[PDB]
From Swiss-Prot, chain A:
Alphabetized Gene3D superfamilies for the sequence: archaeoglobus fulgidus dsm 4304 superfamily
Coiled-coil ranges (or none): none
Annotated source species: Archaeoglobus fulgidus (strain ATCC 49558 / DSM 4304 / JCM 9628 / NBRC 100126 / VC-16)
Source taxon at top rank: Archaea
Xref: InterPro entries: Endo_dU
Family matches, as Pfam families: DUF99 (PF01949)
Entry similarity comment: Belongs to the UPF0215 family.
Protein name: UPF0215 protein AF_1433
Curated annotation (Swiss-Prot), chain B:
Protein name: UPF0215 protein AF_1433
PANTHER family with a match to the protein in the record: UPF0215 PROTEIN MJ1150
Annotated organism of origin: Archaeoglobus fulgidus (strain ATCC 49558 / DSM 4304 / JCM 9628 / NBRC 100126 / VC-16)
Family per record: Belongs to the UPF0215 family.
Cysteine disulfide links: none
Highest taxon of source: Archaea
InterPro entries membership: Endo_dU
Pfam families: DUF99 (PF01949)
Amino acid sequence: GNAMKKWRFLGIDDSFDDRKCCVVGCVTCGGYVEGFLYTEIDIDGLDATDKLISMVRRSKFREQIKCIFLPGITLGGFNLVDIQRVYRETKIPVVVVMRRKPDMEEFDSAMRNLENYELRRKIVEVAGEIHRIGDIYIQTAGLTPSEAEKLVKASLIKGNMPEPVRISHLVASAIIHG
Amino acid sequence: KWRFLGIDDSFDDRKCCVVGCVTCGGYVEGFLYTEIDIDGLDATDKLISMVRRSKFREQIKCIFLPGITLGGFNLVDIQRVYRETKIPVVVVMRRKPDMEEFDSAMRNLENYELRRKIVEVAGEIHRIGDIYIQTAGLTPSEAEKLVKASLIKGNMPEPVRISHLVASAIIHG
């Protein structure tokens, strides 16, 4: 509770234009910014999971990071992140936090025309159930929905997205769209 | 309670990025990003251009820099930044720069005369306790007040600390 508010959290978000996608990680402790991570992924590509795990394995904080937060299960548009794989390879649980429910049928209608639709379908399936609690939607790897909920709450400063996600979004957007 | 804009850079053998961070009471509110030439001449323009751009531009109390030296020796004309932006500039440094050695280690580059003038206009270096500052558009005393107001932990302006972390992650991490 009070205790979990002090745990070290990694928040990741992206930004992309017509040509480049960057992915930013931010490490916070009680909202206090301690470090950043950076990488680039292929737009609508297939490398996001590998790229994200490799990025984390470069953190000097990896043994102290208690949770990874993500804004969805895709980055760079349609570059899916296998959250179970991230959990397994990094040993850090993952909470996906979405302030808008994704339209998964719509998403698939796009995905079905991309390279290796079979892998993409599998990655979406392993993300599991979308849980509605409060005004946000979550998916998780390595946590029950209740545990995920506690972690999201503990990661908030002002507003409804985990603090390091909010900050990584601001960085990534500045790199691309500025 | 002011918004402060803290700028830092990072570079390697190929690229130099410059990152701006806007904080209010240490709370991160926004970021700015540009690239400049290593050991080049475009930093002042790029920095002014970056500030203009931005959505907090008329809310910024001052701009903090960790030196005038971005991208190695791509020097920032702080008087020009202040004149063009109307935002005062405070340079905050942990180490008293040996400007004798600085003038020597630069003679190799194109248009040294231009560079020499940029060094000169930054003006007097003041020991402000513990750090050293230069200013454009504020007195030592007003600058001192703003530096103190911008600290969270440690002796460097919070948004400078945070822009360093970002820039270094992009280039080196």
